[PDB]
Scaffold this active site. Structure first.
Site, short mmCIF file in Angstrom:
data_model
loop_
_atom_site.label_atom_id
_atom_site.label_comp_id
_atom_site.label_asym_id
_atom_site.label_seq_id
_atom_site.Cartn_x
_atom_site.Cartn_y
_atom_site.Cartn_z
N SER A 69 -17.81 -25.63 107.71
CA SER A 69 -16.84 -25.08 106.77
C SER A 69 -15.66 -26.08 106.74
O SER A 69 -15.19 -26.55 107.80
CB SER A 69 -16.36 -23.72 107.28
OG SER A 69 -15.34 -23.18 106.46
N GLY A 70 -15.20 -26.43 105.54
CA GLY A 70 -14.09 -27.36 105.40
C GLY A 70 -14.38 -28.83 105.65
O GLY A 70 -13.49 -29.66 105.54
N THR A 111 -18.01 -29.57 99.12
CA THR A 111 -17.72 -29.36 97.74
C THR A 111 -16.94 -30.50 97.10
O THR A 111 -17.20 -30.84 95.96
CB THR A 111 -16.99 -28.00 97.58
OG1 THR A 111 -17.91 -26.96 97.92
CG2 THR A 111 -16.50 -27.77 96.15
N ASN A 140 -10.67 -23.13 105.54
CA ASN A 140 -10.62 -23.89 104.29
C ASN A 140 -9.86 -23.14 103.18
O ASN A 140 -10.24 -22.04 102.80
CB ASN A 140 -12.06 -24.21 103.87
CG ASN A 140 -12.14 -25.12 102.64
OD1 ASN A 140 -13.24 -25.57 102.27
ND2 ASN A 140 -11.00 -25.39 101.99
N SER A 190 -12.42 -22.52 100.35
CA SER A 190 -13.75 -22.23 100.84
C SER A 190 -14.76 -21.66 99.83
O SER A 190 -14.45 -20.74 99.07
CB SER A 190 -13.63 -21.27 102.03
OG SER A 190 -14.91 -20.98 102.56
N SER A 191 -15.97 -22.23 99.82
CA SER A 191 -17.04 -21.77 98.94
C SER A 191 -17.61 -20.52 99.59
O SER A 191 -18.11 -20.60 100.71
CB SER A 191 -18.20 -22.79 98.89
OG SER A 191 -17.82 -24.02 98.33
N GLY A 196 -23.72 -25.05 106.34
CA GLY A 196 -24.64 -25.42 107.41
C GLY A 196 -24.83 -24.20 108.30
O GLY A 196 -24.48 -23.10 107.90
N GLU A 250 -24.38 -21.19 110.77
CA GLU A 250 -23.18 -20.43 111.09
C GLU A 250 -23.32 -19.73 112.43
O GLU A 250 -24.22 -18.90 112.62
CB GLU A 250 -22.88 -19.37 110.00
CG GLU A 250 -22.55 -19.95 108.62
CD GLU A 250 -21.89 -18.93 107.69
OE1 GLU A 250 -22.39 -17.80 107.58
OE2 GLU A 250 -20.87 -19.28 107.06
#
Ligand SMILES: Nc1ncnc2c1ncn2[C@@H]1O[C@H](COP(=O)(O)OP(=O)(O)O)[C@@H](O)[C@H]1O
Ligand SMILES: OC[C@H]1O[C@@H](O)[C@H](O)[C@@H](O)[C@@H]1O
Ligand SMILES: [Mg+2]
Length: 1039
Positions: free
Chosen positions: A175-176, A180, A221, A224-225, A445, A447
Site C-alpha cells: 500500500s502506498g 497507481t 496512502n 489509496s486504491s 500485493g 495483505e
C-alpha cells in the site's frame, strides 16, 4: 540529442553523477555489527582468506571471520549506481539494497533487476514525466536509455508490434508503494507514442473518474486504491490506440459506512460537498461533512495539500469528456447524496421490540434525491416482508437489524453505482474488435494485517495466483534459454510450489476453504462457528498449509507465499451471501430516476447470477473473475514492475533499512535472481567472455577468431572445474558463483601487473610486454628500445657482446636481468628462458641458438628470450630483422616499430661504410626528424682504412643526435674460428680504445660496457618519463 548532452534535464534527473582501484587489491564485505540486527550493515575490508573462510576488519576495529557461504561480498565501488543490477558479481541482500540506496539518494527511483523493474517511491515530485521525457524514450531500447517506467512501456509496445503478441504489465507492491502513479505513467506513455485525440482524452480521463469513487485516504496512502484494476489498452494492427477496457476487483464497500480513525470515506463524498454549486447543494439537501454520520466519525474530513472543491471540478470535467450526460451526472450525485442521507436515518426502540423512525428528515431527503417513495422506503427498512410458504409476512426489525439493513442498502447502492460507472466507461472506450492490446494490472500485493477477514483471503488468494504466474514465467524463460543454447538441465516447475496453498483455498475435490464456505453459506442453520468448526474438521492437522490456532476459536491460519496469515471467520457467511431485503430491491426498482433504476434492473449489475443462472456466492463470483483475469494474462507476454515504499511515514529522502529490505524479501525481487541459482544463472556470448578474460591465459588474443576455443583455453588454464560450466551454442554457461570467481581472478591479475606502475621499472614493462605484445602488437605503446641495422651491420654481434656470450643464429625481444652476487659470495650460473617454453631453463647457450632456429622455421610474432646473468646489466632490447618480396615486409615491420614515439631507436652502422647514404639512420631520421630519440652505434671501427677516422661522428658532428653516438668493435671471423670468446674480446676492445691515438680521449664513452650502461640508463629514464601516459593507456584498454 538530450541522451548525450550532459547539460540536459535527462542527464540531470535520470543519469548517475560522473586507476586507483585498478592497482589496489583491496576486497570489502557487508556485515552486521549486531547479529540480532540483520537489517543494519557495515562495510569491512578483507584481510585474509583460507580454503573456505574470510577474515575482515570491522569499522569498530576488530578482526572478524565468516564462512565463504554466508559471506556478503561487496561489489567494486565502480558499480555503485548501475542502471541494471543484473550485471553485478554479488547480488546479496546488502549489495542489492546498497545499489538502490546509492541511486535513491541521487533521486533515481528506477533500477533494473533482470526481468524486474524496481521503482522506489520518492514521495516527492521529480520532473522525469514531461512530454520531452516521453519523446526521449520513444523507440529507444532498454540498453540504450536509463531505467524508467516509460522505457519498459516502450519495450512492451515494440514487442507487441514486432511479435504480434499481446502484452501485460504487472505493477505490484505494498500500500502506498507507487503502483497507481506508475500505472498512470504507462497509460500516459502509450497514449502519446501510439496516439489531442478525442479517444485519447477519454482514455486518460477515465482514471480520474474511478479514483474519485474508488480511492480514499487511509493511514498508509492519501490516495489509496480501494479496488484493484486491469486496464486493457487496445490497438489496431498498425499500432494506434483504438480503445480501452477496465475491470475492477474487490471494491471496499464497507468503507462507505465505516472508516477507522484519521482515514476518510471515498473522495467523491468530500468532493461533492465542497464542489457542488449552490443550486446543486439545494437540490441535493447537502451540508458540511460534519453533519453526516458516514463522514464525521474518523476525525478527518480533509487531506493536506488536496482541495476537494478543485478535485470536484476535475471529476465533473472528466465525466463530461468521457460522455456522461448532464442528467446522468446529476443522478450520480443524487445517489451519492442519498447514501449520505441514509446514513443519517436514526432508528429508535419502539413501544415494543420493533424499531421506529421519529424524525423523517433524513429519510425524506434520501427519498427525494433517490426518486423513491419515503413511506415505502421506511417500511422496507424496518418491516421487510419475508415469504412464509405462500404468504408475505412483515418482519418488524429491531434497531440493530434495521440499521444493518440500511447499511446493506448503502453498500449495495455504492457497489452497483461503481460497477455502473465502469460499464459506462467501457461502453465508450471498449471496442469489440481490436488487433492487439497491452494490459496493465494495478492491484494490491499480499495483505497481512493483525486482523484479516474474507476480503483479505480474496486478495491473498489473488496474489498466490500472481506469484505462481511469475515463478512459472521465469521457469519457462529459463527452460527456453537452456533449450535454445543446448544446455542439458531440467528444473522442477517453479510454480508447482504454490499449488498446494491455492488448492487449499479454491480446490473442488478435496473441497477447499471457498467450497466449504459456499456449502456452509447455503446450509440451513449454519453459523460462523459451524463454519470454523467445519474448516478445522477438514484441514486441521490434515493440510500442511493449514493451522488451527492454539487458543483462538474464531481464527485459522493459511501459509501463504509471503508468510502465514490468520483469518477471523466472523461475518463470513453474511459476506459470501451479501443479502439485501427484497422489499428494498422493489422500492428502488420503482424509482423515478433512470440511473437508480438501472442499478436494480441491469442483470449484469443488480446481481451475481446472470439471467438464467443459479445462485452464486460472492466467493464463487470472485473465483470466476480471477480465473478469467489469469486466462487473459496467460495469453500475453508479461512485464513486471516492483514498487517499493521507502518508509512508513510518507517522507522523501528517508530510505529505511528494515522497511526496504523487508519488501525486497517478499516482493520476489531477491527471488527473481535466486530462483535459477541451482542451474546456470550466468552465461556469456563467447566473444564477450574472451574480450574480457583473455588476460588470464597465455597466447589468447582479446579477439581470437574461434571464440569458443579461446574460452575453453582460459577455463583450462585457470583449472576451472568442468562441472561448474557448460558450453552453449553461442554462450558459455556457469554455475552460481563460478563467474564471480573468474572476475575476481581478473581483478587480482590486473592489480598484479599494474601496481608496479607506481628502481625496478624495467621488469614491470617486461611483464606488460609478455602479456600484451606476444602476438606482435603493441596496443599499450610500451616504452622500448628498438635496434635497427643492416644485415651486415654486425648488430647481432653487438647484442652478443652486450650479453657477453654467443647465442644468435622474427622480432627478438631480449630481456636481460642482472643477477647479484650470491648471498654466500659465489657467482650464480647464467641461463636463458623463452616465453613459449614456460618451464624450461637453457643453461647451454648453444641450445638457445638452436631453439631460436627451431621456433622460427619473416613474421611479426616476436620470440621472447629472457637471459639471467651476473655479467649483464638490466636491459630490454627489441632486435628487428636487418634491412624485394621479403625486404618489403621487413621495412614495413621496422617502420611499424620505430614509428611510435615511445620507442628509442638504436641505429647500428658499420664504420667501414661512410656516413652519407647510410641505412638505419635514414629510416631513423624519417620517423625521428629532430633526432631526439635516436642513438647511433658505430661498429667495425677497427676496420675502416689507413688514415680513415670516425671521431667526427663519434663527437657528434657529421650528424648530431640528442642521445649521441657510441663506437665499438667486435670479434673477427678468425677469432670465432679460434677459441677467442666474447667478454674476452671485450678485454681487447677496452685496450683498443684506451690505447688508440685519437679515440683514447673518448675511451671512457666507448665500448660494450659503456654502451650497455647507457642503454640501461636511457631505458630507466624513458620508462619513468612515459610512466604517466602509460597509466592512462592501461586504464583505458582495461575498461
Ligand atoms: N513516481 C512518483 N512520483 C511522485 N510521487 C509519487 C510517485 N510514486 C508514488 N508517489 C507518491 O506516493 C503516493 C502513493 O502512491 P500510489 O501510487 O497511490 O501507491 P499505491 O498505488 O501502490 O497504493 C502518491 O499519491 C504520491 O504522493
Ligand atoms: O476449481 C477448479 C479451478 O477453478 C479456477 O477458477 C481456479 O482459478 C483454479 O485454480 C481451480 O483449479
Ligand atoms: Mg493504488
Amino acid at each position: 540529442d538530450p541522451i548525450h548532452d550532459r547539460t540536459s534535464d535527462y542527464h540531470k534527473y535520470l543519469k548517475v553523477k560522473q586507476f586507483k582501484l585498478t592497482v589496489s587489491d583491496k576486497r570489502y564485505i557487508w556485515y552486521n555489527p549486531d547479529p540480532k540486527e540483520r537489517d543494519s550493515y557495515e562495510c569491512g575490508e578483507i584481510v585474509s582468506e583460507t580454503s573456505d573462510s574470510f577474515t575482515f576488519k570491522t569499522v569498530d576495529g576488530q578482526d572478524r571471520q565468516v564462512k565463504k557461504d554466508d559471506a556478503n561480498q561487496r561489489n567494486p565501488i565502480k558499480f555503485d549506481g548501475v542502471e541494471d543490477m543484473s550485471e553485478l558479481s554479488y547480488l546479496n541482500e546488502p549489495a542489492v539494497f546498497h545499489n538502490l540506496r546509492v541511486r535513491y539518494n541521487q533521486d533515481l527511483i528506477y533500477t533494473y533487476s533482470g526481468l524486474f523493474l524496481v521503482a522506489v517511491n520518492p514521495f516527492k515530485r521529480i520532473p522525469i514525466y514531461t512530454q520531452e521525457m516521453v519523446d526521449i524514450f520513444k523507440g529507444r531500447r532498454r540498453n540504450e536509455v536509463a531505467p524508467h517506467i516509460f522505457a519498459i512501456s516502450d519495450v512492451a509496445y515494440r514487442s507487441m508490434l514486432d511479435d504480434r503478441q499481446n502484452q501485460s504489465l504487472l505493477i505490484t507492491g505494498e500500500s502506498g508503494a507507487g503502483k497507481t502513479e506508475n500505472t498512470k505513467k504507462v497509460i500516459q506513455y502509450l497514449a502519446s507514442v501510439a496516439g489531442s485525440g478525442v479517444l485519447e482524452q477519454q482514455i486518460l480521463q477515465a482514471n480520474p473518474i474511478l479514483e474519485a469513487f474508488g480511492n480514499a485516504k487511509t493511514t498508509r496512502n492519501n490516495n489509496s486504491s480501494r479496488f484493484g484494476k486491469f486496464i486493457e489498452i487496445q490497438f489496431n494492427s498498425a499500432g494506434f490506440i483504438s480503445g480501452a477496457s477496465i475491470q475492477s476487483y474487490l471494491l471496499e464497500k464497507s468503507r462507505v459506512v465505516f472508516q477507522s480513525e484519521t482515514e476518510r470515506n471515498y473522495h467523491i463524498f468530500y468532493q461533492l460537498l465542497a464542489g457542488a454549486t449552490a443550486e446543486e447543494k439545494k437540490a441535493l439537501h447537502l451540508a458540511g461533512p460534519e453533519s453526516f454520520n458516514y463522514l464525521n466519525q474518523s476525525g478527518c474530513v480533509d487531506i493536506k495539500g488536496v482541495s476537494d472543491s478543485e478535485e470536484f471540478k476535475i471529476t465533473r470535467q472528466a465525466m463530461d469528456i468521457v460522455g456522461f450526460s448532464q442528467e446522468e451526472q446529476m443522478s450520480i450525485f443524487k445517489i451519492i447524496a442519498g447514501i449520505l442521507h441514509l446514513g443519517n436515518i436514526k432508528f429508535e426502540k419502539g413501544a415494543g421490540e420493533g424499531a421506529v423512525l421519529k424524525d423523517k428528515t433524513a429519510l425524506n431527503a434520501a427519498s427525494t434525491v433517490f426518486g423513491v417513495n419515503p413511506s415505502v422506503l421506511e417500511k422496507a427498512l424496518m418491516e421487510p416482508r419475508i415469504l412464509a410458504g405462500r404468504d408475505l409476512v412483515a418482519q418488524h426489525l429491531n434497531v440493530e437489524k434495521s440499521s444493518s439493513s440500511r447499511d446493506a442498502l448503502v453498500k449495495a447502492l455504492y457497489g452497483r453505482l461503481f460497477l455502473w460507472l465502469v460499464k459506462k466507461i467501457n461502453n465508450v472506450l471498449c471496442q469489440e474488435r481490436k488487433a492487439y492490446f497491452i494490459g496493465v494490472l494495478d492491484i494490491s500485493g499480499f495483505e497481512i494485517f493483525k486482523v484479516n477477514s474474507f476480503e483479505q483471503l480474496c486478495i491473498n488468494y489473488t496474489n498466490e495466483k500472481l506469484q505462481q504466474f511469475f515463478n512459472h514465467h521465469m521457469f519457462k524463460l529459463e527452460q527456453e534459454e537452456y533449450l535454445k543454447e543446448k544446455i542439458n538441465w531440467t528444473f522442477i516447475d517453479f510454480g508447482l510450489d504454490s499449488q498446494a496453498t491455492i488448492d487449499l483455498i479454491d480446490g473442488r475435490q478435496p473441497p477447499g476453504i471457498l467450497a466449504l464456505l459456499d456449502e456452509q453459506s447455503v446450509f440451513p442453520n449454519a453459523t460462523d462457528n459451524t463454519l470454523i468448526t467445519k474448516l478445522h474438521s477438514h484441514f486441521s492437522k490434515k493440510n500442511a498449509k493449514y493451522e488451527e490456532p492454539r487458543f483462538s476459536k474464531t481464527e485459522f491460519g493459511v501459509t501463504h507465499y509471503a508468510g502465514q496469515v490468520m483469518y477471523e471467520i466472523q461475518d463470513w457467511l453474511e459476506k459470501n451471501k451479501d443479502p439485501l431485503q427484497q422489499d428494498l430491491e422493489l422500492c428502488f426498482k420503482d424509482s423515478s430516476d433512470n440511473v437508480v433504476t438501472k442499478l436494480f434492473n441491469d442483470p449484469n449489475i443488480a446481481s451475481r447470477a446472470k439471467k438464467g443462472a443459479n445462485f452464486i456466492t460472492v466467493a464463487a463470483q470472485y473465483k470466476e473473475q480471477l480465473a478469467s483475469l489469469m486466462a487473459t494474462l496467460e495469453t500475453t507476454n508479461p512485464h513486471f514492475v516492483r514498487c517499493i515504499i521507502p518508509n512508513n511515514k510518507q517522507l522523501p529522502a528517508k530510505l529505511e533499512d528494515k522497511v526496504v529490505l523487508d519488501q525486497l524479501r517478499c516482493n520476489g525481487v531477491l527471488e527473481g535472481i535466486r530462483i535459477t541459482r541451482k542451474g546456470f544463472p550466468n552465461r556469456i556470448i563467447y566473444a564477450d567472455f574472451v574480450k574480457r578474460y583473455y588476460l588470464l591465459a597465455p597466447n589468447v588474443p582479446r579477439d581470437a577468431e574461434d571464440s569458443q576455443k579461446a574460452t575453453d583455453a582460459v577455463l583450462k588454464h585457470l583449472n576451472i572445474d568442468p562441472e561448474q560450466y557448460r558450453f552453449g551454442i553461442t554462450k558459455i554457461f556457469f554455475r552460481a558463483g563460478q563467474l564471480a570467481r573468474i572476475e575476481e581472478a581478473r581483478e587480482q591479475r590486473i592489480s598484479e601487473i599494474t601496481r608496479g606502475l607506481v628502481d625496478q621499472l624495467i621488469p614491470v614493462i617486461n611483464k606488460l610486454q609478455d602479456v600484451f605484445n606476444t602476438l606482435g602488437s603493441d596496443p599499450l605503446d610500451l616504452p622500448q628500445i628498438v635496434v635497427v641495422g643492416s644485415q651486415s651491420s654486425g648488430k647481432s654481434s653487438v647484442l652478443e657482446n652486450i650479453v657477453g656470450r654467443d647465442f644468435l643464429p622474427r622480432p627478438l625481444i631480449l630481456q636481460l636481468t642482472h643477477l647479484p652476487i650470491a648471498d654466500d659470495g659465489s657467482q650464480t650460473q647464467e641461463w636463458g628462458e623463452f616465453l613459449h617454453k614456460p618451464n624450461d631453463m637453457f643453461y647451454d647457450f648453444s641450445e638457445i641458438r638452436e631453439e631460436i632456429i627451431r621456433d622460427t622455421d619473416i613474421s611479426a610474432q616476436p620470440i621472447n628470450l629472457k637471459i639471467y646473468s651476473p655479467h649483464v646489466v638490466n636491459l630490454t632490447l627489441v632486435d628487428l630483422p636487418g634491412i624485394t618480396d621479403i625486404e618489403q615486409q621487413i621495412r614495413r615491420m621496422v617502420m611499424a616499430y620505430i614509428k611510435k614515439q615511445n620507442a628509442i631507436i638504436v641505429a647500428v652502422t658499420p664504420a667501414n661504410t661512410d656516413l652519407a647514404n647510410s641505412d638505419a639512420l635514414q629510416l631513423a631520421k624519417e620517423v625521428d626528424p629532430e633526432g631526439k630519440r635516436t642513438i647511433g652505434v658505430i661498429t667495425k671501427l677497427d676496420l675502416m682504412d689507413k688514415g680513415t677516422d670516425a671521431m667526427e661522428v663519434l663527437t657528434g658532428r657529421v650528424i648530431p643526435l640528442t642521445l649521441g653516438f657510441i663506437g665499438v668493435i667486435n670479434r673477427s671471423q678468425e677469432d670465432i674460428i679460434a677459441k677467442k670468446s666474447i667478454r674476452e674480446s671485450l678485454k681487447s676492445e677496452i685496450l683498443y680504445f684506451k690505447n688508440h691515438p685519437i679515440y683514447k680521449s673518448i675511451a671512457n664513452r666507448s665500448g660494450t660496457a659503456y654502451l650497455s650502461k647507457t642503454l640501461n640508463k636511457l631505458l630507466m629514464f624513458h620508462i619513468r618519463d612515459t610512466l604517466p601516459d602509460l597509466k592512462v593507456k592501461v586504464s583505458k584498454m582495461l575498461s
